[PDB]
């Protein structure tokens, strides 16, 4: 282990990325990592198996503009998905030709299908090309992050929500410099409010949603585009339908001024409501809140219908309903997995979506609502080469947390294995921000299952949004600790039930999921054989200061206030490193072999989090003693600055895991 300087007046200095001492600190930990990974002889064998299982063709869900359909395609191992078009159900843009692949993050086709606006990481910048001949327009727009490009129905330009060179809502006309873009909204009073936006399917209304923090609540402003004196060239006169942060609202459809909205107002599991803009105080349930299932999303389709995607004990259910009445017309349950990517719009009569699952790589279903609304027909099916899925099975069980609450978890494993404790086990989780963790497809997970005899578990802990807003709130702010408790209880069940045994269990997560993993190792290190935390939040007292971690106080709180500081100090990972051997009746326990993963250019979760936690752990556990009991290594894998890049990382983590758990190859 290398030398790390503890500033007693300890690792505040790592918060500066560019000093020598930090950049040499990196190199030493890079240097140490590779030395460790060199000992994990199964890295290469995993790496090749991942590549062989990922090598299958994948189609994105298609969408229609005018007479044309568009979709992403990948032949198997291309760096980045390629965007294609066709005349019925051709390359349009191939990012593998730029830098040998960054992918497209923005992609947006005009209503007439003439123009394709898209965005690349120039090191997000939006460009536009003509679909007829693939020639570029000159228009270049910078300072975009996650805003889409929303085309007006005149095909003359589009809305987008850039930051300054204080988020703004702007309109760009085709064939102008970005400096001529109309400013539609900003708020210097509330620099932290951020924006999402949308245009109604009929083209009459531009909708602007304002949000405060990552909380699921938003304002709703409506600009009627048909009542502008000289269109958007004026400058705006928003109708402020909702001007507070009390509930969430998302527009699903409108008939003239009569709008249908999804909301969580007085409805933690969500519902569809109806309001007339011309009479704004009268809201009426259209599809009431289910007291059982989360209404996750809704989409108007085939002129007069609706498709509701419900989440019901962490499985999807799709309902077809009448738009005007709200009446149930059909209900299609979905096997364990996830459907999503429903991009069909109100004047589309064929609906497409994607189904993936732990043992199912990707199916694009097509429901023609005109002709055969009953059955899902397969449009595309991906097949994992050399893999027979009927030797495996996934099942769901519910497990009691500390406080009594049920925690649903999925368990993927080989069929008919004896529950004898002898199987290596990987547990994933996230638990935060109302994010739903679905059991989707991962090729590396298959390698683990087949070539390591592994058992995999996905834990739907609190903090997520799986049982609605109550599930969320029961795992945020003062209640964050429950999330960690849920996860620990999940491992305990895997042990007691006899899938695996303490120290034969690995855990992995990213971002908040990184927090999750860091928190749990401190509190219960005797449980785990291996921990892997991908760019987590590890400094809970200071996270808010950097880049855009300020929009997570909604879910975490903040040290600034005292009541909150006291939740935080209790689980903040760097401030909770302790020698588990220095505790009574706990002496053969050490920390699991740990791998902290992070980039150099992640300006979401800044890497200081990861670095400071590494510094601390190596100190308290290893180098702070002369003959530390901590034998298990504590390293970082740092990604200097794409399919193959992403495969390398995972191959490493899995090789490390296999070493850590003494899992042999099969």
């Amino acid at each position: 282990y290398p030398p790390v300087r503890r500033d007693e007046t300890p690792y505040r200095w790592l918060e500066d990325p560019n000093s020598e001492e930090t950049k040499e600190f990196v190199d030493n930990q890079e240097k140490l990592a590779n030395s460790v990974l060199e000992e994990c002889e199964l890295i290469d064998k995993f790496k090749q198996k991942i590549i062989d299982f990922v090598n299958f063709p994948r189609c994105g869900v298609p969408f229609r503009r005018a007479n044309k359909y568009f979709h992403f395609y990948n032949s198997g191992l291309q760096a980045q998905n390629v965007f294609q078009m066709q005349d019925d159900l051709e390359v349009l843009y191939d990012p593998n030709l730029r830098e040998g692949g960054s992918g497209l993050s923005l992609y947006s086709v005009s209503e007439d299908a003439k123009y394709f606006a898209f965005g690349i990481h120039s090191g997000v910048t939006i460009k536009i090309l003509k679909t007829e001949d693939r020639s570029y327009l000159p228009d270049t727009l910078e300072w975009v992050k996650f805003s889409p490009a929303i085309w007006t129905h005149d095909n003359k330009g589009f809305f987008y929500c850039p930051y300054p060179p204080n988020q703004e809502a702007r309109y760009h006309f085709l064939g102008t410099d970005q400096s001529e873009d109309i400013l539609l909204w900003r708020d210097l009073e509330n620099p932290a409010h951020h924006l999402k936006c949308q245009i109604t399917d009929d083209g009459k209304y531009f909708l602007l949603y304002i949000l405060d923090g990552c909380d699921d609540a938003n304002k709703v402003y409506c600009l009627d585009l048909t009542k502008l004196p000289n269109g958007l060239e004026s400058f705006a006169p928003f109708m402020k339908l909702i001007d507070s942060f009390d509930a969430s609202y998302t527009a699903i459809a409108n008939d003239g001024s009569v709008f249908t909205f999804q909301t969580n107002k007085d409805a933690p599991r969500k519902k569809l409501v109806r309001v007339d803009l011309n009479n704004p105080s009268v809201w009426t349930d259209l599809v009431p809140e289910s007291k059982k299932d989360l209404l996750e999303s809704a989409h108007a389709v085939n002129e007069n219908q609706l498709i509701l995607r419900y989440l019901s004990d962490v499985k999807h259910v799709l309902e077809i309903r009448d738009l005007e009445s709200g009446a149930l017309q059909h209900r299609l349950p979905i096997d364990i997995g996830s459907v999503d990517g429903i991009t069909a719009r109100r004047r589309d009569s064929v609906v497409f979506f994607k189904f993936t699952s732990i043992l199912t790589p990707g199916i694009v279903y097509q429901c023609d609502l005109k002709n055969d609304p009953t059955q899902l027909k397969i449009f595309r099916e991906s097949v994992v080469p050399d893999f027979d899925r009927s030797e495996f099975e996934v099942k769901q069980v519910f497990v009691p947390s500390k406080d009594g609450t049920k925690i649903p978890i999925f368990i993927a494993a080989r069929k008919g294995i004896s529950l004898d404790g002898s199987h290596p086990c990987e547990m994933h989780g996230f638990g935060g921000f109302g994010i739903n963790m679905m059991p989707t497809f991962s090729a590396s997970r298959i390698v683990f299952l087949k070539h390591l005899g592994g058992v995999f578990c996905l834990a739907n802990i609190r903090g997520g949004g799986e049982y609605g807003e109550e599930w969320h709130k029961a795992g945020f702010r003062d209640k964050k600790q429950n999330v960690f408790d849920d996860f620990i209880s999940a491992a305990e069940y895997l042990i007691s039930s006899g899938y695996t045994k303490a120290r034969r269990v690995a855990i992995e997560g990213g971002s908040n999921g990184g927090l999750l993993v860091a928190a749990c190792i401190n509190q219960r290190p005797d449980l785990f054989g291996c921990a892997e935390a991908n760019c987590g939040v590890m400094d809970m007292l200071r996270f808010h200061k950097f880049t855009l971690g300020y929009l997570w106080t909604g879910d975490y709180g903040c040290s600034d206030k005292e009541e909150e500081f006291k939740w935080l100090i209790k689980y903040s990972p760097i401030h909770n490193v302790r020698r588990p051997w220095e505790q009574p009746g706990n002496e053969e326990t050490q920390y699991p072999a740990t791998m902290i993963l992070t980039a150099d250019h992640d300006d979401r979760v800044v890497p200081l989090h990861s670095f400071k936690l590494l510094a601390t752990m190596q100190h308290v556990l290893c180098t702070s003693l002369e003959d530390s009991p901590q034998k298990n290594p504590i390293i970082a894998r740092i990604q200097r600055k794409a399919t193959m890049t992403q495969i390398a990382e995972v191959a490493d983590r899995y090789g490390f895991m296999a070493k850590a758990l003494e899992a042999p190859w099969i």
């Binding site: 991942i50 990922v54 994105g60 990948n74 980045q80 992609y107 989707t440």
Partner: peptide, 6 residues
């Protein structure tokens, strides 16, 4: 738009 489900 992930390139691969790794």
């Amino acid at each position: 738009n992930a390139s691969a489900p790794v």
